[PDB]
Amino acid sequence: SKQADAYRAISLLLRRPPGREAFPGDVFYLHSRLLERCAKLSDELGGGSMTGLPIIETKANDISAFIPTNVISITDGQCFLESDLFNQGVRPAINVGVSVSRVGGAAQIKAMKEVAGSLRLDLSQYRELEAFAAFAS
Amino acid sequence: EEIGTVIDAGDGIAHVEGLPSVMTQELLEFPGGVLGVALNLDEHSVGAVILGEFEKIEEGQQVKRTGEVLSVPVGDAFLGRVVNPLGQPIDGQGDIAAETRRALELQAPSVVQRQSVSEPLQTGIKAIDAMTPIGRGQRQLIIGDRKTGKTAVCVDTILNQREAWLTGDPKQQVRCVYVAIGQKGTTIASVKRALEEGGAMEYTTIVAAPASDAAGFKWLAPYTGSAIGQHWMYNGKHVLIVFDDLSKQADAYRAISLLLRRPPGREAFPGDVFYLHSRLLERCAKLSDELGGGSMTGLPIIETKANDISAFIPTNVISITDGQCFLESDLFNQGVRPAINVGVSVSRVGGAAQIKAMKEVAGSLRLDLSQYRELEAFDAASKAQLDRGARLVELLKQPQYSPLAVEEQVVAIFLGTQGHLDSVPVEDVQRFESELLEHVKASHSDIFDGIRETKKLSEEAEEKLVSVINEFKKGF
Amino acid sequence: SKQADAYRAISLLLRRPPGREAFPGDVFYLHSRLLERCAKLSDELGGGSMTGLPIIETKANDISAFIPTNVISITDGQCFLESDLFNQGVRPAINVGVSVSRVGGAAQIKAMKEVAGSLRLDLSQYRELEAFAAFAS
Amino acid sequence: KTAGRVVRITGPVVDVEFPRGSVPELFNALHAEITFGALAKTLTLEVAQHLGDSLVRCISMQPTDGLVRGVEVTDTGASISVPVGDGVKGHVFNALGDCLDDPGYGKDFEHWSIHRKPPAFSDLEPRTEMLETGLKVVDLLTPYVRGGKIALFGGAGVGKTVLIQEMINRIARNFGGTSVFAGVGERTREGNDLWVELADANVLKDTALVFGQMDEPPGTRMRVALSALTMAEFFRDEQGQDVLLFIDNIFRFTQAGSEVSTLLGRMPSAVGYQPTLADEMGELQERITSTRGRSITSMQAVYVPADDYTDPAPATTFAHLDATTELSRAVFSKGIFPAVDPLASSSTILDPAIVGDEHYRVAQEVIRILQRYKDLQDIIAILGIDELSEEDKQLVNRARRIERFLSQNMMAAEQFTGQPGSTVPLKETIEAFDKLTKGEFDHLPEQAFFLIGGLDDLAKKAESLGA
Amino acid sequence: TAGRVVRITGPVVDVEFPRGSVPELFNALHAEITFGALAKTLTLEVAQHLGDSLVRCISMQPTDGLVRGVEVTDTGASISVPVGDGVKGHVFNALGDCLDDPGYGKDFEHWSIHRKPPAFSDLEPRTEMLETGLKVVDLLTPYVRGGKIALFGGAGVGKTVLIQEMINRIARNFGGTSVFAGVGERTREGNDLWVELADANVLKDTALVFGQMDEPPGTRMRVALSALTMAEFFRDEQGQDVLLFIDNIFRFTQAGSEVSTLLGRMPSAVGYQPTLADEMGELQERITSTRGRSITSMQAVYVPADDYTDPAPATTFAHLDATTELSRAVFSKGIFPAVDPLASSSTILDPAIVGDEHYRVAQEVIRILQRYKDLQDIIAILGIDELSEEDKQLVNRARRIERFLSQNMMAAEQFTGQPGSTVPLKETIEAFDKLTKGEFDHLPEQAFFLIGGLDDLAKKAESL
Amino acid sequence: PAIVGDEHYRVAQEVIRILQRYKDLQDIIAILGIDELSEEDKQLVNRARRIERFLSQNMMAAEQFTGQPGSTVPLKETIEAFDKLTKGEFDHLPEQAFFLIGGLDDLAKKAESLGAK
Amino acid sequence: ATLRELRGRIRSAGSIKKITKAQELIATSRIAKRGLCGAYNAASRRRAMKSATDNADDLIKALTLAANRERQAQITQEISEIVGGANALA
Numbered sequence A, C: 001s002k003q004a005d006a007y008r009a010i011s012l013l014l015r016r017p018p019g020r021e022a023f024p025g026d027v028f029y030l031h032s033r034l035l036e037r038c039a040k041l042s043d044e045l046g047g048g049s050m051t052g053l054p055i056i057e058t059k060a061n062d063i064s065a066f067i068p069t070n071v072i073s074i075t076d077g078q079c080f081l082e083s084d085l086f087n088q089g090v091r092p093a094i095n096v097g098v099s100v101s102r103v104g105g106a107a108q109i110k111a112m113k114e115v116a117g118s119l120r121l122d123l124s125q126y127r128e129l130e131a132f133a134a135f136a137s
Numbered sequence B: 001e002e003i004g005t006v007i008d009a010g011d012g013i014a015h016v017e018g019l020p021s022v023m024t025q026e027l028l029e030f031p032g033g034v035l036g037v038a039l040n041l042d043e044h045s046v047g048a049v050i051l052g053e054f055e056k057i058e059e060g061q062q063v064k065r066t067g068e069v070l071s072v073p074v075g076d077a078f079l080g081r082v083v084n085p086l087g088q089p090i091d092g093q094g095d096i097a098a099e100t101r102r103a104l105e106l107q108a109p110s111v112v113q114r115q116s117v118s119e120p121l122q123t124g125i126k127a128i129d130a131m132t133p134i135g136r137g138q139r140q141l142i143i144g145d146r147k148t149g150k151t152a153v154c155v156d157t158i159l160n161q162r163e164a165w166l167t168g169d170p171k172q173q174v175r176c177v178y179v180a181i182g183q184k185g186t187t188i189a190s191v192k193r194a195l196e197e198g199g200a201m202e203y204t205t206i207v208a209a210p211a212s213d214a215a216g217f218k219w220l221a222p223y224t225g226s227a228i229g230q231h232w233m234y235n236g237k238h239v240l241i242v243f244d245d246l247s248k249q250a251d252a253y254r255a256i257s258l259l260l261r262r263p264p265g266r267e268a269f270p271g272d273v274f275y276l277h278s279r280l281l282e283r284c285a286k287l288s289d290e291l292g293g294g295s296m297t298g299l300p301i302i303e304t305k306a307n308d309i310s311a312f313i314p315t316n317v318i319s320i321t322d323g324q325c326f327l328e329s330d331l332f333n334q335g336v337r338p339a340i341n342v343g344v345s346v347s348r349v350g351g352a353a354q355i356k357a358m359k360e361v362a363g364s365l366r367l368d369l370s371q372y373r374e375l376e377a378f379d380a381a382s383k384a385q386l387d388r389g390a391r392l393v394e395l396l397k398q399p400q401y402s403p404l405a406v407e408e409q410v411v412a413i414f415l416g417t418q419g420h421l422d423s424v425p426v427e428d429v430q431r432f433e434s435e436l437l438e439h440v441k442a443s444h445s446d447i448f449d450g451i452r453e454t455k456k457l458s459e460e461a462e463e464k465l466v467s468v469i470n471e472f473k474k475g476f
Numbered sequence D: 001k002t003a004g005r006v007v008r009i010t011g012p013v014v015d016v017e018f019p020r021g022s023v024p025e026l027f028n029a030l031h032a033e034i035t036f037g038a039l040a041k042t043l044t045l046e047v048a049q050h051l052g053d054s055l056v057r058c059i060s061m062q063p064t065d066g067l068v069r070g071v072e073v074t075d076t077g078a079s080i081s082v083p084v085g086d087g088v089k090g091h092v093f094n095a096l097g098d099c100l101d102d103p104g105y106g107k108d109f110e111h112w113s114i115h116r117k118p119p120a121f122s123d124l125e126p127r128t129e130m131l132e133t134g135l136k137v138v139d140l141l142t143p144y145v146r147g148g149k150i151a152l153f154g155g156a157g158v159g160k161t162v163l164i165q166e167m168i169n170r171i172a173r174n175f176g177g178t179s180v181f182a183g184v185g186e187r188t189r190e191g192n193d194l195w196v197e198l199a200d201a202n203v204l205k206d207t208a209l210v211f212g213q214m215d216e217p218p219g220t221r222m223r224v225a226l227s228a229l230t231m232a233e234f235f236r237d238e239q240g241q242d243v244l245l246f247i248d249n250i251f252r253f254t255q256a257g258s259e260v261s262t263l264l265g266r267m268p269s270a271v272g273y274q275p276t277l278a279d280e281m282g283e284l285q286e287r288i289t290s291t292r293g294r295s296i297t298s299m300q301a302v303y304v305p306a307d308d309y310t311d312p313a314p315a316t317t318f319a320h321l322d323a324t325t326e327l328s329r330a331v332f333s334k335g336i337f338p339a340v341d342p343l344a345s346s347s348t349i350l351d352p353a354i355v356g357d358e359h360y361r362v363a364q365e366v367i368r369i370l371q372r373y374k375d376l377q378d379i380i381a382i383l384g385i386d387e388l389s390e391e392d393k394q395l396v397n398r399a400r401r402i403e404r405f406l407s408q409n410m411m412a413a414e415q416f417t418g419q420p421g422s423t424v425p426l427k428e429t430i431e432a433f434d435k436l437t438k439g440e441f442d443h444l445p446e447q448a449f450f451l452i453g454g455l456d457d458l459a460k461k462a463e464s465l466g467a
Numbered sequence E: 001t002a003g004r005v006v007r008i009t010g011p012v013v014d015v016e017f018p019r020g021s022v023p024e025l026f027n028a029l030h031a032e033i034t035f036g037a038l039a040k041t042l043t044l045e046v047a048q049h050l051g052d053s054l055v056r057c058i059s060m061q062p063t064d065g066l067v068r069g070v071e072v073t074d075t076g077a078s079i080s081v082p083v084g085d086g087v088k089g090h091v092f093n094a095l096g097d098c099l100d101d102p103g104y105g106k107d108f109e110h111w112s113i114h115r116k117p118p119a120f121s122d123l124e125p126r127t128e129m130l131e132t133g134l135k136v137v138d139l140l141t142p143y144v145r146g147g148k149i150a151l152f153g154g155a156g157v158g159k160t161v162l163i164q165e166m167i168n169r170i171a172r173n174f175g176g177t178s179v180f181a182g183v184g185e186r187t188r189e190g191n192d193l194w195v196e197l198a199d200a201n202v203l204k205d206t207a208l209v210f211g212q213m214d215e216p217p218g219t220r221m222r223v224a225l226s227a228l229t230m231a232e233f234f235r236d237e238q239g240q241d242v243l244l245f246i247d248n249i250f251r252f253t254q255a256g257s258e259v260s261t262l263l264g265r266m267p268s269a270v271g272y273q274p275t276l277a278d279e280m281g282e283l284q285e286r287i288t289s290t291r292g293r294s295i296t297s298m299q300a301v302y303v304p305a306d307d308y309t310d311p312a313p314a315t316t317f318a319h320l321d322a323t324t325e326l327s328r329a330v331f332s333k334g335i336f337p338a339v340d341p342l343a344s345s346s347t348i349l350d351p352a353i354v355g356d357e358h359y360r361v362a363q364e365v366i367r368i369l370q371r372y373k374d375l376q377d378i379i380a381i382l383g384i385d386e387l388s389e390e391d392k393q394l395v396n397r398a399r400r401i402e403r404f405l406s407q408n409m410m411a412a413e414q415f416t417g418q419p420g421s422t423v424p425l426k427e428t429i430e431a432f433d434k435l436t437k438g439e440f441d442h443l444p445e446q447a448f449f450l451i452g453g454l455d456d457l458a459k460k461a462e463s464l
Numbered sequence F: 001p002a003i004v005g006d007e008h009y010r011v012a013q014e015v016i017r018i019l020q021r022y023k024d025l026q027d028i029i030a031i032l033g034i035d036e037l038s039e040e041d042k043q044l045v046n047r048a049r050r051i052e053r054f055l056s057q058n059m060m061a062a063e064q065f066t067g068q069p070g071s072t073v074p075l076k077e078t079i080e081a082f083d084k085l086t087k088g089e090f091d092h093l094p095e096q097a098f099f100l101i102g103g104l105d106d107l108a109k110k111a112e113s114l115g116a117k
Numbered sequence G: 001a002t003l004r005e006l007r008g009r010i011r012s013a014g015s016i017k018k019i020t021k022a023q024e025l026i027a028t029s030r031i032a033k034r035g036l037c038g039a040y041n042a043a044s045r046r047r048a049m050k051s052a053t054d055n056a057d058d059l060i061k062a063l064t065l066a067a068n069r070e071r072q073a074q075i076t077q078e079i080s081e082i083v084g085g086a087n088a089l090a
Ligand SMILES: Nc1ncnc2c1ncn2[C@@H]1O[C@H](COP(=O)(O)OP(=O)(O)OP(=O)(O)O)[C@@H](O)[C@H]1O
Pocket: B145, B146, B147, B148, B149, B150, B151, B152, B153, B337, B338, B398, B399, B400, E347, E350
């Protein structure tokens, strides 16, 4: 977010046309060009890799803002942290209901893949049932 | 001849140097048979909005005058033809023999050149003809979300004019102009197919500006259609014009205005978007007898977003037209088609233009439905009232492409407003109705002829109708 | 508010670049320079005073509009009047919770400060309790 | 020389170059000719700006289609002027003073410039004299002022024009003076309907109609109100007539000004409006006023774009009024006519010193009950009334009956319903709403209160319903 | 006659040509960046004629290293892509360059990517149904031949397998071909798709055109048109049915917005390009049926802020003929394809189009499944015991119906060894009519998992 | 915990958790009323109201506005008081006893002024 | 502040909907075996809470539509101000 702000500052000072949120027409390109360099290389090129963990700061948890929207589109998955979860003591404050990894189980070892298989559905069912906490009998 | 030169071009706007004698709003020919309209004339150049294939415009090209302010050819030869906003055939059926040419920005009839709307325009839709009747020269907005049956209502209205056309009487005939602005090409083709199957293309003209057109054509199409209709209206003919839809025309005009760097206002629309629609719809009029008595009936279509009729363009058009038919997505998705909403739908000037029989039958009906909606959302009398309301809701359901003649609508509404449907099950109310109507046409068709000739339902014909209903019900 | 509108009209006609709601950059400066001339002079200057009572009209009770925000940040407190309170019979329709005087007891005689020292806080707490206990049985 | 030539044409705005020493003054009327056949006409331009280098920018009163650069422009030496006198009564005029029902009529009349200063401040006197209408809601909550300024705000299709017709019926019919109607940017067929209705009611002979309607360039839609006001000012200042001035719709004047401002190359204000929005409204409205001994009762319809009462145009209009009837889409959806928002509407004379203590007390009680009902809508929308206290349930039933009883069968609503309208004396209105607020009709069903007149109507309707 | 760079502002390049050699709008120009590290050939696309022999162009590659005054060569045509049967089985960028084999296809016939839609009279005036052979699609959400199908669903719902399934069915049932248009394609996912299609042995049936995320907005804007041009060649010249996949169409709209902003145009509502509707129409009107052949498109559609009234989805849905929503819930039950039968919709599921019997059976299925969804919460929280007997009968019938919407897909043969099925439309209609009537409630639930028509149902019932 | 110590961190986190839950429950209490909460939620709401009031303080700089002289509370006393509050040790005192005071002695005095103890 | 208020209302309505749906299911269970019972005082709790849940769903839908209108309008107004400043500096 700070880098996008700096680039917008430069672009405006250079009198380049502004768009939504006054960003230039190539801010998405800024971030996508940056983040496509994070890759897993083929064995022909040495098999090296670079994993990117971009951080985006939302305001009032508006992930539909311009720069969050761009970076969400660019990346392979999102860990959404929330201050309400943080205050509830859920630390790290990841919202497992909306967080996603499109690589998914391919990025886990087999043991984790097995023990963690039921976690997602268990947590979703828990969130559905939480309203009935006091009526457990 | 004066010849100008393109000095720059971009995004549907060209600038031409020269052409000192050019008129404001004149048409200009660019090579490749491209046309533009001279919007801005300054000491340096002429700013032209390109109406056509803008990608063929190049700096240095020769621009010629046409000597004509923005205008289209008009005449009877346009019936049965499909044309683009310039009046050029796109149906591949040869040349159109224009009677004359008509400028697109001629002003509407004045306060003293009109007369009150008094002749009905029968849409053939029971819901509309009974609850929001449309008179000739009225402007009735058809407004609703996408895929709510707006085009179906307008196409059925055009189809309903077939009988009036076959009379041969210019005081009864209605020539139709369908204007497609930003519609899918296949939807325009299917509209043409339906009109052809109904024999409507004989008296219908289509002005097409499909979704692949540039903004200039979409902006111009309604005025082209209106000019073609006005040529007939000022010759004592009655015209129905459908604008499908003016939301897309507003979007096209906003695109042109932004490309001209005109500062926008509400929802990025230019300040004169209201003027755009209001001058167009003001030209739909019922003329005084001194001017021949012709009329043009406007049926503008507006597409709302999430049934938000309080948005800018919807409110503009509501404040221009003489009432609206509001098609709901909830009703439409429940199978209540046409999906008219009584709470919102009204005809401001249609009551005077509604035959006596229809008035008598539908009077109590309108309020009955309006109240029954709430009573349903919420004793023996109340339960009977709910049953009656459900039967009436089924009564006003109508299949597509099947407009009803006015006398048939009278009988159909009579079935429901006089308790003759309480016996039949709700799910049969339609089939029963249809069957019964056919019966009256097969035999006891004297009722239809009487209603058509007198425009009222006599007590004796009413009693004969009840007796026919009872005999058919026992047969039913 | 009307003076701010007039100044905006003038600035736009002089083609000075506009800002929020098309207001000129120095609209806050207009009001602040105006309202800081209301002062309580030192005894050396004669001890005279000018008390300012600026009036701001909001629309739809939106005190977060540009000009209301400016003037609120300039003055020594505000009396918020609300049509809901007015229609309820609270006349003057002063919203106690958000209305305040930044001078306080120094602007009151001793007797008044004595009998009204905690009235505004008591009324704020009362409104809070009335809202909270609305449906308590 | 002395004659200019067109240099630039940008829609209905024309730049004209004049010889040095012959630059026309601001607001002067200039004349140009369009010769192209179908569009042939004489354009009246109005000087709006001095651009420098002997150029002026003018607003065309007619569409500029067919105008060519370099055509000769002649300066009339004066601004637009309209015929005035007793003869304008019974006739329809356009913004330029041309009679439409009888072309050429009024050319021999005295002619007044449509631009003039408002009355001097020393001549202004506040008006506090109730103009009883017979409409329950107006009379009780937003009493109109005789010689004052009344506005009817509302979004699209909520009943502004039907209420203007209502007030023409109730106030103009029995009027002993002159009436002026200004159609500003409204439906032409509505102008025709009004002309015919006035003719039928015999009110036309007392009425001057001026029309610049929707299908006009923004300059005409900006100036037609001034032309009608010029006729009204003649009646006020030269004849001592009590004058009724109806304007439908003044928002259209503001909107035309916005279009023109965009065409003039001015930098836009908020929501794209002209920077001079408040200034233009101020000039026009300040001319629309009574003076000491000289009465103009003015009633103006005010469109509210997109039902947005915060929009700058109505927002600046609010300050110019003595009584404000705000029509509500929410009220309209309930079938309540007139669709007045009883909490948002206001009147400067609804205070005890003017209308008396009992009228004021009853009005305040009605407003308090309605406000309490509005405050409870959050709960009711979800749970309904069954969760409220006993006091609140009683208040909610009372408020529903009150809100229905503010509705009325209007004189002008017959055309839509076939039901003749009703007139309720102010005293009966005060009594009826006193009884309503006190709970004396809590037993009658709600619908008995809907679209009726006074207490006899309520008794008859409740009896018809079994109560 | 060559031009020269005059101004460089990021991807915007102004170029001056001699008086009479100005390129036409949308012409492709070539420039050279010679700096060794960044050396490349820039493709510029003429966007505007600025006058005085200047043209404003959008660079298709980053302009880093470009120098003022370098020579600009006019190609005399717009961006042109290779066409023919040779493009199948290969990956291309938006400019026609082969990515898996640089230089491949340079000798093929080349078609300009800017083309008009079929002439109004050449359009088919009557809608048609694209019988896929998949029970759920054919019954509940029939696809329109020449129409557009929105596709929804996050990762892990079988979306890629569904795409492979449609490629399979268009190739083997209609004898057609596929074009995939990765608009704003993630490079990792483009590589994954390439490898997966090769593994599925459907790569030979499909041409891949990638406009990657890390490219300037111009290529992301034009990639959809490039893929469409290849599909148009297949339909109009080879006389084949074509399935055109676009992922993501919203990224085409957003790239258009970025380009419009770069060119100094004033944004329209919500910041989109003023010509948003016109651009979308120009793209979508080329996807039709003409002269007996059709391009059918399945398009992934992103909805900003889940706001369907947002200008981008609002413009896109003006052109969409059907909607297929893939649900994680359905996938988690092993029901493949994981099409959410209640959220999915089709604009041709009407009696007038698919017939009365089809409509009736589909509505019955929808009603039963909706009642089941309503009873789901009671089942979960209070238990199925609380339900009335009629409710239990409905639950059993609905569970069987929803399992029978599953099918063994052609693309599923590579994970489960069993081959796929193609159920004729009549068979599906009668099977689901019987299922709604309750003629299979006695059979075990598992009998309905991943089978074709009634013969498979009987076979699996007996095998249990 | 590393800088301020385990006890301070724990008490602060518990106060934040209670106040967050109270914020979550406020809309429900506004519409459906408190009685429809579970017993634990009712207890938490009472505790949260007392905690939020006890976080307020009569300040030295505020005497010009309230007429009440200010107070200063040691950190250890603050931690102990809020530890007791989060355990419900003061649940029996009226919430008005916790408004604009200093430490636990001020709380006791105000409670006795309000008829509690 | 309009959008912030609308989002607060959306959160409130969602919580109310969750509680009322839970209460409706609890009432369903209790049927087989306070004043939130609709017009009972003036089974019934189950119907009343089903009605309340439907009303809260409708409120959430309407509030979300209003919030999206406000979000779009704010984007448009912000762009209008930005481009107006840029044009005036052109
Ligand atoms: N009375 C009716 N009975 C049955 N089906 C109908 C009826 N009216 C319309 N339909 C069908 O409903 C669908 C929508 O109709 P139509 O295309 O007229 O609506 P629309 O609002 O104009 O749509 P769009 O947003 O696509 O322009 C079409 O399938 C049409 O066949």
